[PDB]
Ligand binder design. Structure first.
Ligand SMILES: Cc1ncc(COP(=O)(O)O)c(CN[C@@H](CO)C(=O)O)c1O
Ligand SMILES: Cc1ncc(COP(=O)(O)O)c(CN[C@@H](CO)C(=O)O)c1O
Lengths: 398, 398
């Protein structure tokens, strides 16, 4: 045995999945991507319904032009830390775009969303302090807790009551960070932020909200679930990513706290990595600024989401949410075999959705996840519904 | 007090540095970048000698063309995990380029170099296993140790003897990972890998070598210090980055271990982050493949390094290394004031080098770090030497 012997179980599990005759759902290659909604997968034209490209920004002509210009003018990379040689014109641009987007004085960009959560959580809360998080928080939030030296307190999934009880049992004096998400990505349901934030404040805690799955399409300014629920000016830190609505890679944290900039002085995942390529921060800047006034896209996205959610529910699918509360629609299935057969029938028929990842999914839960795009046409949505009807009936789900 | 009160000391320290009248060395903005060797900083044309762009690939015409084409054909981002919707044509291309570059069957690309170290170390070595690392290892290697649940064993900087003693005191049965770097980035000196690897193997340990600061210009195939020292076929895992010789963002690990691919099934920093934008992996692919035969660049780089190292030593500067052993030249100074005055005089005279970062530098050590580029001309190197002579004499360093 050696260091890789520990993976023998996972290897056997993947082979067991493949023994069923399905395409490996975790090795899909997009050979060509024609648009935000169309790709070629396994030599077949396929509608994309599992890409989390909520506002279709990845093919926006202004976004693409900004990226090409940045490559030409500034080259392919910075090769350095933001603290040394890695801050170019476009890095200053992208941080100001975020300040303008969120109405904050502070904005710190990280090289990935994962690293923003890893770094902000492990840097803000130290030894003798507390991080209080939802039991089903994103992996990056859990990894930030592991990276730090704080006391970690999980509360039962989606319970305002359990947050309140768990917070209330902690000592009063030490500083505390409550970490919440606006939209939770497994089922696409929304957090009761208004109520949870009131509880956090009662107990003197600071609040961090991850708005990765809401940017550009929740709240009057598209700032997130917290804005939609009336919490403008009440959230200490908002963490987000460039890899959803914005359409590239990178992470960020925004805040009005007067000492917020000091995070750059301490945060290891900010300091000890190369800054993003000029093209990446240029595309992000342009996308973020367009997202401030992308009203037609926002309306199309929600229209499409309501149509898909309403249609699948009407057909008899069991969904992760009773009402259409985000741009994620989760279809719940009875076993791994049913999920596999459904996913394959959809793929073979020309539709890509996500199969739940075993590392992300609790045992005994089986689903497919759909993500709506502002650039889906009403026609594509009806085509998708017809494909779900055909596959669902053929597999015996409905 | 709140969660940011812990930064009050760091804030005061930065202000103390600024009280000296220097430009903030940790807030430099590259307003324009004309080439790998020239920028506009504070409205002034400046020679770049602190960018770690060893092979000048960031402005290579093939590299830039590949990036622009990828933006046009595939859009600005993938918006998803490699395990789901994030594997495009160009991700498969970049992993094959690495296999060809290193002569390995295995290659896993991560969204940053930092995340490659974080993930590979925390995933390979589990509870009851050991990670044995040099005391002065890169922050990302230390952070990977923190992220995992292994026993961490540091050995005294640059000691084959201490590695041997520390390893020998551990129980024989548990699996062990020895982590080394080829070139250490603080002083630009080289590790005695041949001897350290023989020690690791005597004790039955697996070896990971970080070749971030050697790719493309050490060894017959440019694979790194390990190749230069005759260790081809003896290193279990090689970790690297795209942010130095390659010229963009991203991380990687390569290996011939038959179970290596299984890392994709387990590694949280691989799974739970968006894959790199098409343009980024296209630029990396093109750069990596060009680096396989970039002999003129490699010769220019080493010629320039020897000229700079030899010239600064000749003038009376105290350097971090007695002989020119890498493309990093560290100039050692007596105190923070001397380092500050030197750095400012160089900047005002039209040269950018790095001031040592306080988070990276041990107390009582003060240096400036120069990084050579294959695209520096002999003329620029002599200009740089003249600037060091003028600044060094004016400040009293020489
Ligand atoms: C030996 C070594 N290994 C790994 C990394 C991380 O690579 P990344 O910067 O591409 O994430 C670095 C980064 N080094 C630079 C950032 O690019 C730094 O300021 O620390 C490194 O020096
Ligand atoms: C709520 C939340 N917060 C943070 C992140 C990390 O952002 P990044 O993917 O841009 O690093 C994700 C990533 N989510 C995707 C990868 O992009 C995943 O497969 O998990 C997220 O869902």
């Amino acid at each position: 045995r050696d260091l890789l012997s520990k993976f023998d179980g996972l290897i056997a599990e993947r082979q067991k999945l493949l023994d069923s005759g399905v395409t490996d759902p975790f090795a899909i290659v997009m050979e060509q991507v024609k648009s935000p909604t169309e790709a070629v997968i396994r030599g077949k034209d396929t509608i994309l319904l599992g890409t989390y490209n909520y506002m279709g920004m990845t093919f926006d002509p202004d976004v693409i032009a900004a990226g090409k210009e940045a490559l030409e003018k500034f080259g392919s990379g910075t090769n350095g830390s933001r603290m040394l040689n890695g801050t170019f014109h476009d890095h200053m641009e992208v941080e100001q775009a975020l300040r303008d987007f969120y109405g904050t004085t502070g904005a710190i960009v990280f090289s990935t969303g994962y690293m923003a959560n890893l770094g902000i959580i492990s840097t803000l809360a130290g030894k003798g302090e507390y991080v209080i998080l939802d039991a089903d928080s994103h992996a990056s939030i859990y990894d930030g807790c592991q990276q730090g030296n704080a006391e970690i307190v999980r509360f039962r999934h989606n319970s305002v009551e359990d947050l309140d009880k768990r917070l209330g049992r902690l000592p009063k004096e030490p500083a505390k960070l409550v970490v919440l998400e606006g939209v939770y990505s497994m089922l696409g349901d929304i957090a009761p932020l208004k109520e949870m934030v009131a509880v956090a404040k009662k107990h003197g805690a600071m609040v961090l909200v991850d708005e990765a799955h809401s940017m550009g399409f929740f709240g009057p300014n598209g700032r997130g679930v917290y804005e939609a629920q009336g919490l403008e000016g009440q959230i200490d830190f908002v963490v987000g990513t460039f890899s959803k609505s914005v359409g590239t890679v990178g992470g960020f944290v925004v805040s009005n706290h007067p000492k917020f900039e000091a995070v750059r002085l301490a945060c290891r995942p900010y300091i000890f990595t190369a800054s993003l390529p000029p093209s990446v921060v240029a595309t992000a800047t342009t996308s973020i600024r367009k997202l401030m006034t992308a009203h037609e896209k926002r309306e199309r996205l929600w229209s499409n989401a309501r149509a898909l959610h309403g249609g699948l529910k009407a057909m008899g699918f069991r969904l992760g949410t009773e009402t259409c509360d985000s741009a994620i629609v989760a279809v719940m299935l009875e076993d791994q075999e049913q999920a596999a057969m459904m996913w394959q029938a959809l793929l073979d028929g020309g539709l890509y959705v996500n199969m739940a990842r075993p590392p992300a999914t609790p045992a005994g839960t089986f689903l497919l996840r759909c993500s709506i795009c502002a650039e889906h046409t009403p026609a594509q949505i009806q085509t998708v519904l017809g494909m779900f009807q055909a596959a669902g009936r053929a597999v015996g789900v409905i």
